[PDB]
Enzyme design. Structure first.
Site, PDB file in Angstrom:
ATOM      1  N   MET A 174     -14.135  10.924  -5.969  1.00 15.00           N
ATOM      2  CA  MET A 174     -13.316  10.088  -6.649  1.00 15.00           C
ATOM      3  C   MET A 174     -12.642  11.060  -8.003  1.00 15.00           C
ATOM      4  SD  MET A 174     -12.379   8.100  -4.460  1.00 15.00           S
ATOM      5  CE  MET A 174     -11.462   6.780  -5.389  1.00 15.00           C
TER       6      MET A 174
ATOM      7  N   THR B  64     -10.764   9.259 -10.991  1.00 15.26           N
ATOM      8  CA  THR B  64      -9.334   9.123 -10.802  1.00 15.26           C
ATOM      9  C   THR B  64      -8.502   9.641 -12.036  1.00 15.26           C
ATOM     10  OG1 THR B  64     -10.063   6.728  -9.833  1.00 15.26           O
ATOM     11  CG2 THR B  64      -8.046   6.895 -10.859  1.00 15.26           C
ATOM     12  N   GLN B  65      -7.377  10.112 -11.570  1.00 12.31           N
ATOM     13  CA  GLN B  65      -6.515  10.997 -12.389  1.00 12.31           C
ATOM     14  C   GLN B  65      -4.976  10.688 -12.252  1.00 12.31           C
ATOM     15  OE1 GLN B  65      -6.699  15.336 -12.762  1.00 12.31           O
ATOM     16  NE2 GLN B  65      -8.837  15.537 -12.320  1.00 12.31           N
TER      17      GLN B  65
ATOM     18  N   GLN C 295      -3.224   4.543  -8.700  1.00  7.14           N
ATOM     19  CA  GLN C 295      -4.698   4.762  -8.321  1.00  7.14           C
ATOM     20  C   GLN C 295      -4.805   5.975  -7.267  1.00  7.14           C
ATOM     21  OE1 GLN C 295      -8.564   2.937  -7.209  1.00  7.14           O
ATOM     22  NE2 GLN C 295      -8.392   5.173  -7.698  1.00  7.14           N
TER      23      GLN C 295
END
Ligand SMILES: *[C@@](C)(CO)[C@](*)(O)[C@H](CC(C)C)NC(=O)[C@H](Cc1ccccc1)NC(=O)[C@H](CC(C)C)NC(=O)[C@H](CCc1ccccc1)NC(=O)CN1CCOCC1
Ligand SMILES: [Mg+2]
Lengths: 235, 233, 222, 244, 231, 240, 212, 195
Positions: free
Chosen positions: B107, B1-2, C1
């Site tokens: 992810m 996640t970024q 997110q």
């Protein structure tokens, strides 16, 4: 000592060649393939008369369309059969079909050379794998601990193999009926066996498209033994 | 996640009769701050491919390094590295597409939208898109970000389907691209006036143009506009 | 997110005849309110007279098709060039999909071909691997528009024999390839009218014992 | 590779014996004799220290007799260092049992697990076996007073009276002669000392060359007490039986 | 002698005996021939049986639509190496959408075989391979030896009595190299080549095994009645 | 981890480590199994060079694997504990998953499989143990007697013996056991078992152990006096 | 879904509907919710279609391996416990399954086991599982006797699914009937609710709430 | 699951456990036995999360039975309870804890005394004259505080237990379909069939 996976100067793996000697000490197993089916027969060879011979299990089911006979260090065959059964059922789960006899044999033979310094030594048992599929029909395979397998029209393995194989060379033709093959296995087993052949020290089995793999009863084999003796006396 | 930090805006491109054209401005935005002005977002691979990248610039620089390394690796034990076994546009794309989808599947994406433009060994035009999600598609015209909303409509007036490609020259095609870049400067708040443009032709090869500027702009009509409704002065 | 999924729109349709089977799909590819491509095919010949489409999130769709195509290749290597039957393909695809049960492929999958008796076959899958053989299936964005039309015209649902007091049903019969293509074309023009993600072009793949043929038709581009 | 230098510690001889186990037992036969005698009202543990020096600190010393818990002790014969590795394991095992069941560990269970550890070193791992033989003396509420022995093979057996280490053949004959079932602790004390006194390789048996311990119910009412004898207490018990 | 216990040991003259013993397993294997023109590449293989009741051991294996090999020596080792090639060809297709170059295929096999000759516990592969293929630089023929050595050739042969076919191809070099756009003639030349390695036995219908790959021809194998044309 | 292949083939096709494990079995105290019409009896030798033993606490030669199956052995005592433990764990595991106790054949097949695994696993030696496994399948009254050995082979026996001088007692059983008519009662079966051990043992005092297993988890071990009565009776009939 | 199975004098009746839904979208009317594990074992499916379909076919593979290894058909208890132990390993991961393992063996006789995805395993004579289970219970319980004939038992199972198919929005399509005897399972046909409802209404005189 | 009770009297321990198994708005079964025999003189009842309960009970059962075979000896109720407590005490800090509450009723043959242990899913053990898990305790504890005497007979204990079930059947919201009652004493474990 020396490495387990060592080559001899002649270009052969010592351990594989030594395991082949162990198989020659084993009890006889014969297989014959016809267009009506494949027959598998073995010598039980009880070490003592007190031993209950029906507990000697040297012919074994892998799936409904594939059977198996063994010779040599028979304890080593248990994990080979376990793998074969799992391979057969797993393929049915993944593809909703029967698995080809050749593909089953190849899967078993992949275990063979997975030894070294994986298991500590090669298997000391040879297998005769018989079956049927829609593509190549009735088939008989000889699976060795070298990882090699040959298809055969007929094949004998064990202590009386070279004598029985020479007999199968003369007797086999492409038009053999199933009944003719049953008698032929009994005939050749009786020749190479030490003790006198009867329903208690020898076992027959077959695989047909219609009924699948079946191990014969001691009552059924006993009649085929009686039919065989009568036919040899009749000329 | 970024989350993307330093970012690049639109990359636009199209096919023409003998090859492909691709363009992108030289800006590295830091949110609303127009932080960096000397950023090259078109990266040539060999003499037959140009990869245009938008989105996160740190991830763009990582992708630069991968392509640079790909050229090195292809040259290893390869006597035909500058001939039959040279890197094709399709090879470079499929590699990036594989990486992008693998990273989204873990992810931890490369926060980019990428257009690979080039010409194959048999002369065929190559133009394909891939993004952070691993989504891929091809079209006579391709654009990212605001370019998708504003450039594509203009470029599709020139090449609307496949049969319009042979009928489109490099002069007409470049004119449309340069016009689209002007429109983006009018309307995209994270765009700059300075940009780079690249042409890959099956005959004349790779032509890389740096330090281009948007020009011939219409601003004069602004003097007549007063207030927001009723005001007269 | 970060959201690892997306929606690329489009719709697909499979019908089975007596000695044939068709698998159709529009060629439009979208994200949100933008068109990415007017011609991006998503119906593929996978070999062994099996056609396949995985509609929804295109990245997952391409990944699946890629993996199945590869599965066919290794099936040949491991089983002496044996032809992969449509039923065996279907079961294999279930395991591909269910393998990612806890991070699914976001696609509706349909495959078409001939069964081992030579008769037309269509199989359809949910995102996590449940499957079922059917005469008829629509999938994707406009599935809810097309499917009830197919129930009525292919399987003759809610249609009774005239004058029989709603007692005798209209008898089931196989449709010709000509009649099936008429239904496919009408299904997609109707879907194009009323669904925004459907349009641009229609690509049909027809499967007979002779092989895999293709047909292309224009659709409205608005 | 390294195959060249492998002794192969866990293999069979052509006669079906484990080389390393047999050679470990040969090692143990040179260690100081240890005797265990089980009476109806207690157990005696007696052991001979290995040729002592006059400048050895005798009172603050422990070589032969070790405490496993409040109810179980062991007499050692072999390599002391090896024994201590096993003793700490046995001590931990007893506490694991107490922690799990809130009951003191039954003697046999402790003996079996320690013996199972020894067995493992003879079947796998390619390491040398532990060169140790134990005499276990202990009490629990199931079987009461119990004597066991274990050896490098990992085989264990129960006894009424037993010896390990040096001169076991001569020692076992003497115990077999004078032992009887209705024996008391004080009689067993005398038998243990008399047996060592005759089997010893030394000139005369003295207090400084011995370790002694009893496990009686000689505490106050229905509870067991472990007595590891002090030097002066061994001196007195040696005079009381008329050996010195 | 004292230096052949394992692959990790050098002899005093700098030889690896275990690798040489693995090489010996190839010499015992049945003969197989490889040759190529500019358009096509052909494998011919003499298959071997256990006896008249047995099948003939299959010598040729397909690796991709454009690549495959023939084997001589330990068949299970060929199965391992061919499987590795299948995966490498496949990796190149899925990741780069690129058909694996026949030259890279050789480099990969070399490096895989080598690792087994420098570590304790392992053993060398006991099989030789002839890899044919058609890629972006035309037709190719490779010879793999389990020492690690891979060699690109116009033609060659490995196995028992392979020297006869290898001499013939060395004479016929100028002829067969220019058999372009004619599959049947290039096979005929390969069948005549393997015939120079025959003793007491001749080429029968369930004995001969042929494989071909080329410009407009995928890698395909011919057995049974399909090779009756060439006898 | 220690990896050495200890069990390997020799030029003549023998696995010497497995064969030397059989020699360890041949050294062990004699064990015998005889199955009657409605029971199985397991007899075991105990050597008498060990006096001053405590028989209350000393490990018994016959071990319960479950309430309906028993296991005796010949060979290395320490090795037998490992097999017994594994068998007991598998017995409870079978009840847990199949909701039914093991068959005697199944339990034997498992123990035999463990023994086989130790003949082609790296870093381990074979078990120097042969077992006699006896009992009754759940809801079944047919007696079961199986034998295993270090190699891993197993088989069913009407009557069998293992251990030192087993060839002598096997000779006895081969002529004294009728397949057509097995020992009809418990007394007959125990007597034949005791008789067979008396060919080899020495004295019938604290040298013979007898355990009787009957259907539906009915297992009991005989005491000294009970066994001594069989010894006294057999000797008086012998003097004839 | 609606599925049921009940035990009675003449063996076991098993009845299921054939609908599959995705929210309010009716996805299929022709789903097979009974899985034929062997000639003597059946499995019913309710909940997640992929979960049920995948793991109950897998169960069949495990049962086949049992009879190969043990030379004997697996017990209903052992078969149900393989499935229940499997789903228990996945407890909390989000599997959705309500299944019933029905069959006959010599040692057990006719037996039914309820198994669900939170690990519950129950032996019993009557169970109804699915979104329409309550509707099926209402009819089944109020008409159930142990002494039902094979003919009457088949009808009651059929009628109970019809009841649920009618009232439950997420049940319908058609009824699949099975009868399990000492000789194995016997299929008793696919019955479309389209025709079956009106046929039952007319002949039985029930369903007076509906406009005739 | 829901209602499990336990009463220790002079010479025995009596366990009562509800028969209902409910899921959603349906009572799936009304004859469920929420107990497992761990050994001949030790019985464990259980209640809690679906699946977990039986899985845990049978796991404990297997371990105690394994011990019994290995040692040819029956563990004391106190020893069994401590083993069970430790397993739950481990469980509570696992990735997914067993959500199971248990009562352990046993007769110690060495002491000739009945013993009742209450253990919750956290691994909280207490020995008690009478015990309950869940909402049952909110009615039964106060009732037993009044009517219980330490010297009662097994028959007096069953009447005392009937009084508890009657109160629960009057004031509890849910229909728990009665109870299965079992007695643990010097002669082992037996079930009361008419309650
Ligand atoms: C009655 C009929 C309803 O409860 C039964 O219980 C049947 C059981 C039969 C079919 C075995 N149950 C269902 O029909 C079941 C209900 C359900 C749905 C979702 C989760 C749990 C239970 N339906 C399904 O399983 C459907 C079957 C398809 C439509 C053939 N599948 C889905 O809804 C799938 C997969 C759901 C899923 C589960 C776990 C992880 C990921 C996904 N979902 C979709 O296809 C999503 N959606 C459908 C509409 O189009 C856009 C995509
Ligand atoms: Mg529009």
């Amino acid at each position: 000592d020396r490495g387990v996976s060592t080559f001899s100067p002649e270009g052969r793996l010592f351990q594989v060649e030594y395991s082949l000697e162990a198989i020659k000490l084993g009890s006889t197993a014969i297989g014959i393939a016809t267009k009506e089916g494949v027959v598998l027969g073995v010598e039980k060879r009880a070490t003592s008369p007190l031993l209950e011979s029906d507990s000697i299990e040297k012919i074994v089911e892998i799936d409904r369309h594939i059977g198996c006979a063994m010779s040599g260090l028979t304890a080593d065959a248990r994990s080979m059969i376990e793998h074969a059964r799992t391979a057969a059922v797993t393929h049915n789960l993944y593809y909703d079909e029967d698995i080809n006899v050749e593909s089953l044999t190849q899967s078993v033979c992949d275990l063979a050379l997975r030894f070294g310094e994986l298991m500590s030594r090669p298997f000391g048992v040879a297998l005769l794998i018989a079956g049927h599929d829609a593509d190549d029909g009735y088939q008989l395979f000889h699976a060795e601990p070298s990882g090699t397998f040959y298809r055969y029209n007929a094949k004998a393995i064990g202590s009386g193999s070279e004598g029985a194989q020479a007999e199968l060379l003369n007797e086999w033709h492409s038009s053999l009926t199933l009944k003719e093959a049953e008698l032929l296995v009994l005939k050749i087993l009786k020749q190479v066996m030490e003790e006198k052949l009867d329903e208690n020290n020898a076992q027959l089995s077959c695989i047909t498209k219609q009924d699948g793999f079946k191990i014969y009863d001691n009552e059924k084999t006993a009649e085929l033994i009686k039919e065989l003796k009568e036919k040899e006396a009749a000329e | 996640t970024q989350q993307p930090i330093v970012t690049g805006t639109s990359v636009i491109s199209m096919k023409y009769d003998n090859g492909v054209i691709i363009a992108a401005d030289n800006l590295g935005s830091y949110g609303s701050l127009l932080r960096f002005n000397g950023v090259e977002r078109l990266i040539p691979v060999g003499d037959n491919t140009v990869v245009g990248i938008s989105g996160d610039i740190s991830d763009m620089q990582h992708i630069e390094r991968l392509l640079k390394d790909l050229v090195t690796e292809n040259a290893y034990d390869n006597p035909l590295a500058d001939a039959e076994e040279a890197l094709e546009p399709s090879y470079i794309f499929e590699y990036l597409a594989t990486v992008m989808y693998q990273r989204r599947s873990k992810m931890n994406p490369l926060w980019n939208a990428i257009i690979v433009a080039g010409v194959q060994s048999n002369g065929d035009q190559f133009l394909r898109y891939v993004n952070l999600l691993g989504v891929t598609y091809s079209s006579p015209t391709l654009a990212t970000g605001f370019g998708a909303h504003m450039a594509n409509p203009l470029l599709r007036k020139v090449v609307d389907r496949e049969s319009d490609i042979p009928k489109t020259t490099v002069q007409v095609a470049e004119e449309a691209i340069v016009n689209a870049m002007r429109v983006l400067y009018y309307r995209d708040a994270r765009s700059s006036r300075n940009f780079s443009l690249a042409i890959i032709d099956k005959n004349t090869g790779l032509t890389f143009k740096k330090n281009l500027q948007v020009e011939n702009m219409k601003w004069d009509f602004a003097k007549d506009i007063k207030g927001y409704g009723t005001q007269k002065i | 997110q970060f959201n690892p999924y997306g929606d690329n729109g489009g719709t697909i349709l499979g019908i089975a005849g007596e000695d044939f089977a068709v698998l159709a799909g529009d060629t439009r590819n979208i994200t949100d309110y933008s068109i990415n491509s007017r011609y991006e095919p998503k119906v593929f010949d996978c070999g062994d007279n099996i056609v396949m489409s995985a509609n929804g999130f295109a990245a997952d769709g391409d990944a699946l098709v890629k993996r199945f195509k590869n599965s066919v290749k290794w099936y040949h290597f491991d089983h002496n060039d044996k032809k992969l039957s449509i039923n065996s393909a279907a079961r294999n695809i279930q395991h591909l999909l269910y393998g990612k049960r806890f991070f699914p492929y976001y696609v509706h999958t349909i495959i078409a071909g001939l069964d081992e008796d030579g008769k037309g076959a269509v199989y359809s899958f949910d995102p996590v691997g449940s499957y079922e053989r059917e005469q008829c299936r629509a999938g994707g964005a406009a599935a809810s528009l097309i499917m009830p039309f197919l129930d009525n015209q292919v399987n003759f649902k809610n249609q009774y024999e005239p004058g029989t007091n709603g007692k005798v049903k209209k008898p089931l019969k196989y449709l010709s390839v000509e009649e099936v293509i008429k239904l496919v074309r009408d299904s997609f023009t109707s879907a194009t009218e009323r669904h925004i993600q459907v349009g641009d072009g229609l690509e049909i793949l027809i499967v007979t014992k002779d092989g895999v043929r293709k047909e292309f038709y224009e659709l409205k581009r608005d | 590779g390294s195959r060249r230098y492998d002794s192969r510690t866990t293999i069979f001889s052509p006669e079906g014996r484990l080389y390393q186990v047999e050679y470990a037992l040969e090692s143990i036969s040179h260690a100081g004799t240890a005797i265990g005698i089980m009476a109806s009202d207690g157990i005696v543990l007696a052991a001979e220290r290995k040729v002592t020096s006059t400048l050895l600190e005798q009172d603050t010393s422990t070589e032969k007799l070790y405490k496993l818990n409040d109810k179980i002790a062991v007499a050692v014969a072999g390599l002391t260092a090896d024994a201590e590795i096993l003793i700490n394991t046995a001590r931990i095992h007893a506490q694991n049992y107490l922690k799990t069941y809130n009951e003191d560990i039954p003697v046999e269970i402790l003996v079996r697990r320690l013996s199972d550890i020894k067995q493992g070193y003879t079947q796998h791992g390619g390491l040398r076996p532990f060169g140790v033989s134990f005499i276990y003396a202990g009490y629990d509420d199931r079987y009461g007073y119990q004597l066991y022995t274990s050896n490098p093979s990992g085989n264990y057996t129960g006894w009424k009276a037993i010896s390990v280490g040096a001169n076991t053949s001569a020692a076992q004959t003497l115990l077999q002669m004078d032992y009887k079932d209705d024996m008391k602790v004080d009689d067993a004390i005398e038998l243990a000392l008399k047996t060592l006194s005759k089997t010893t390789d030394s000139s005369a048996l003295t207090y400084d060359r011995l370790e002694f311990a009893t496990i009686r119910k000689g505490a106050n009412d229905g509870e067991v007490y472990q007595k590891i004898f002090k030097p002066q207490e061994i001196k007195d018990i040696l005079v009381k039986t008329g050996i010195t | 002698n004292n230096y052949d216990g394992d692959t990790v040991t050098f002899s005093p003259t700098g030889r690896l005996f275990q690798v040489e013993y693995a090489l010996e397993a190839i010499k015992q294997g049945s003969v197989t021939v490889g040759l190529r023109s500019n358009t096509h590449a052909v494998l011919v293989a003499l298959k071997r049986n256990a006896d008249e009741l047995s099948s003939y051991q299959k010598k040729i294996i397909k690796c991709d639509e454009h690549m495959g090999l023939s084997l001589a020596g330990l068949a299970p080792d060929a199965r391992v190496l061919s499987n590795y090639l299948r995966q490498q060809c496949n990796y190149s297709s899925l990741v780069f959408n690129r058909k694996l170059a026949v030259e890279r295929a050789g480099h990969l096999l070399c490096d895989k075989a080598q690792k087994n000759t420098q570590s304790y516990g392992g053993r060398p592969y006991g099989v030789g391979l002839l890899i044919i293929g058609y890629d972006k630089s035309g037709a190719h023929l490779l010879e793999f030896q389990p020492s690690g050595n891979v060699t690109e050739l116009y033609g060659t042969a490995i196995g028992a009595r392979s020297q006869g076919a290898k001499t013939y191809l060395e004479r016929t070099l100028d002829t067969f190299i220019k058999i372009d756009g004619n599959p049947d003639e290039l096979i005929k030349a390969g069948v005549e080549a393997i015939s120079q390695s025959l003793r007491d036995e001749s080429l029968t219908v369930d004995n001969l095994s042929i494989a071909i790959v080329g410009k407009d021809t995928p890698f395909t194998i011919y057995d049974g009645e399909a090779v009756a044309k060439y006898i | 981890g220690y990896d050495r292949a200890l069990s390997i083939f020799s030029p003549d096709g023998h696995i010497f480590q497995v064969e030397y494990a059989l020699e360890a079995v041949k050294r062990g105290t004699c064990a015998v199994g005889v199955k009657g019409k409605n029971c199985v009896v397991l007899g075991c030798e105990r050597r008498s060079t060990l006096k001053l033993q405590d028989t209350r606490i000393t490990p018994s030669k016959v071990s319960k694997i479950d309430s309906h199956v028993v296991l005796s052995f010949s060979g290395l005592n320490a090795d037998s504990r490992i097999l017994i433990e594994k068998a007991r764990v598998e017995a409870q595991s079978h009840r847990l998953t199949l909701e039914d106790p093991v068959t005697v054949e199944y339990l034997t097949r498992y123990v035999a499989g463990v023994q086989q695994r130790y003949t082609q696993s790296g870093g381990v030696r074979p078990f120097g143990v042969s077992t006699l496994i006896a009992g009754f399948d759940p809801r079944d009254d047919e007696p079961k007697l199986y034998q295993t050995e270090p190699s891993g082979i197993y088989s069913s026996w009407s009557a069998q013996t293992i251990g030192r001088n087993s060839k002598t007692v096997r000779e006895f059983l081969e002529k004294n056991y009728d397949r057509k008519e097995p020992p009809a009662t418990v007394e007959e079966c125990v007597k034949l078992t005791v008789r067979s051990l008396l060919e080899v043992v020495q004295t019938g005092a604290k040298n013979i152990e007898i355990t009787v297993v009957k259907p539906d988890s009915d297992i009991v071990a005989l005491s000294s006096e009970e066994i001594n009565q069989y010894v006294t009776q057999i000797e008086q009939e012998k003097q004839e | 879904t609606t599925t049921l199975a009940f035990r009675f004098q003449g063996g076991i009746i098993v009845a299921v509907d054939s609908r599959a839904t995705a929210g309010n979208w009716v996805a299929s009317q022709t789903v097979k919710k009974v899985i034929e594990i062997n000639p003597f074992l059946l499995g019913t499916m309710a909940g997640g279609s992929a979960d049920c379909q995948f793991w109950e076919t897998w169960l069949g593979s495990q049962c086949r391996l049992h009879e190969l290894r043990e030379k004997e058909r697996i017990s209903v208890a052992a078969a149900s416990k393989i499935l229940s132990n499997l789903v228990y390993q996945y407890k909390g991961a989000g599997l959705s399954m309500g299944t019933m393992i029905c069959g006959y063996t010599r040692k057990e006789g006719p037996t039914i086991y309820y198994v669900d995805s939170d690990g519950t395993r129950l032996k019993g004579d009557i169970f109804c599982v699915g979104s329409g289970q309550t509707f099926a219970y209402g009819v089944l319980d109020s008409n159930y006797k142990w002494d039902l004939s094979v003919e009457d038992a088949l009808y009651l199972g059929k009628r109970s699914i019809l009841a649920a198919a009618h009232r439950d929005a997420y049940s319908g399509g058609s009824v699949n009937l099975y009868h399990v005897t000492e000789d194995g399972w016997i299929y008793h046909g696919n019955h479309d609710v389209g025709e079956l409802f009106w046929k039952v209404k007319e002949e039985e005189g029930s369903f007076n709430n509906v406009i005739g | 699951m829901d209602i499990i009770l336990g009463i220790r009297v002079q010479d025995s321990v009596i366990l009562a456990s509800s028969k209902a198994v409910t899921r959603g708005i349906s009572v799936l079964k009304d004859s469920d036995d929420k107990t497992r025999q761990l050994s001949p003189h030790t019985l464990m009842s259980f209640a809690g999360e679906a699946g977990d309960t039986v899985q845990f009970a049978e796991y404990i059962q297997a371990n105690i039975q394994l011990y019994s075979i290995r040692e040819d000896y029956e563990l004391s109720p106190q020893a069994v309870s401590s083993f069970v407590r430790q397993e739950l005490a481990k469980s509570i800090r696992s990735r997914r804890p067993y959500q199971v509450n248990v009562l352990i009723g046993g007769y110690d043959k060495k002491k000739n005394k009945p013993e009742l242990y209450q253990i919750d899913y956290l691994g909280t053990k207490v020995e008690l004259p009478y015990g309950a898990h869940g909402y049952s305790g909110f009615y039964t504890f106060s009732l037993l505080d009044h009517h219980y005497r330490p010297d009662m007979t097994t028959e007096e204990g069953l009447d005392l237990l009937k009084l508890c079930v009657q109160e629960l059947e009057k004031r509890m919201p849910m229909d728990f379909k009665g109870v299965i009652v079992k007695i643990v004493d010097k002669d082992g474990i037996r079930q009361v069939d008419d309650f």
